[PDB]
């Protein structure tokens, strides 16, 4: 009776030591992965400077990825973009078109195969086990060239700060499918550029949008990984506060049961002594 509350106090006390140690683990990981996010932010800028940013395109096939976390102590990160997945997917699919839903991170393969299972063709995980590299993001992007859609929606959490995480969608338009048509402004906007490459522009743009897919997929899962470590740093501060309020309330519950216990057996001794004396 009185020992069950005593070792449950021992449960919540070092859970508050686990979740306080995990918060600084997630904060040290947030600090060293913050400089890689700032460096990868540079290369995504020349491609939206060149190819623009066209989210609401009319496609016949679209590969949408949702970049989730791998370990799931992040507290509201991977569930938020699966809300933002269908809020973006159902916005752009009302034409009876093909849709392939990919997930980076196995917290999406447990979350997207129950809300969109008929359109789920790929699940990628273990991308944060060692580190995120561009060659790893190139092979992930290479499997998105197997299917040949007209757009590539990339759902990820942009690392705004250690407090705020803006969910960001980014689209990559296939060259001879939709990119050459969505730049037509009384002629073309791309005809102002002089191609100084080997073959014709239909092969330069095929090499560029594969580069543009691989660059923004390297940045997406690197932005999302730094948002994973910084939302875990806040979800574990809310766990030490919850396991310190639970421990402070259960200490008073033990102290009331401690005081009632010494009063109870002492009354049992006086009642047995007054029967004899």
């Amino acid at each position: 009776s009185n020992q069950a509350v005593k070792q449950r106090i021992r449960a919540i006390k070092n859970i508050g030591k686990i979740t306080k140690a995990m918060k600084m683990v997630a904060a040290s990981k947030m600090k060293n992965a913050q400089i890689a996010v700032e460096q990868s932010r540079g290369l995504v800028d020349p491609f939206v400077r060149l190819f623009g940013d066209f989210p609401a395109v009319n496609s016949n096939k679209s590969v949408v990825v949702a970049v989730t976390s791998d370990k799931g102590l992040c507290g509201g990160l991977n569930s938020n973009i699966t809300k933002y997945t269908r809020a973006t997917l159902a916005t752009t699919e009302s034409e009876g078109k093909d849709v392939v839903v990919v997930s980076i991170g196995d917290k999406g393969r447990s979350q997207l195969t129950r809300i969109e299972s008929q359109r789920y063709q790929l699940a990628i995980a273990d991308t944060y086990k060692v580190r995120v590299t561009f060659g790893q993001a190139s092979l992930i992007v290479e499997e998105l060239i197997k299917h040949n859609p007209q757009s590539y929606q990339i759902l990820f959490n942009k690392f705004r700060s250690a407090i705020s995480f803006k969910p960001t969608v980014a689209t990559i338009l296939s060259p001879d499918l939709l990119e050459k048509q969505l730049e037509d402004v009384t002629g073309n906007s791309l005809d102002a550029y002089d191609i100084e490459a080997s073959h014709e522009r239909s092969d330069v743009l095929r090499d560029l949008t594969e580069f543009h897919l691989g660059v923004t997929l390297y940045n997406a899962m690197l932005e999302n990984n730094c948002s994973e470590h910084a939302s875990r740093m806040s979800a574990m501060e809310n766990s030490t506060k919850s396991a310190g309020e639970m421990l402070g309330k259960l200490t008073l519950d033990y102290n009331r049961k401690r005081q009632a216990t010494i009063t109870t057996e002492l009354i049992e001794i006086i009642a047995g002594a007054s029967a004899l004396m």
């Binding site: 919540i12 507290g75 509201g76 569930s79 447990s110 979800a235 809310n238 919850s242 639970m246």
Partner: protein, 156 residues
Amino acid sequence: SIAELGIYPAVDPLDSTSRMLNPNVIGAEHYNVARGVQKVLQDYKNLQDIIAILGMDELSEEDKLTVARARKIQRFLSQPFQVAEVFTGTPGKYVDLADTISGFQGVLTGKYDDLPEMAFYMVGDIKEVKEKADKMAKDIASRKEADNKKVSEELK
């Protein structure tokens, strides 16, 4: 602890028992609903410390449906009384027996996952949760309703 949530009457559904809750006495349709209400209220009580120290983001997607349904029926067990209308202002609601079994079938099967949790709070029937879910969304659209001016009354 039920009364501190504001749920009145503050009846513990997992501590109140009856010898009448038997399928050969009240019928098997009334009995199976009550045991289903007590099943998801016990399953919500088994998650009460995981939701405390870790939040609802760590639960399964089949257990977050258990939490949201049990948070709905424990508002739907609440009811305004005809003797509490003097100090609460809200009028009392007498709910018939068949309106309770049919109202609690719908939240268990999933017929009212559309409605918010607070629409079930302090209403009589399952008719009154739909009419309160509208009033909660007419009223947030009533912020853009009109600018009320009181003019030309000083000599009336």
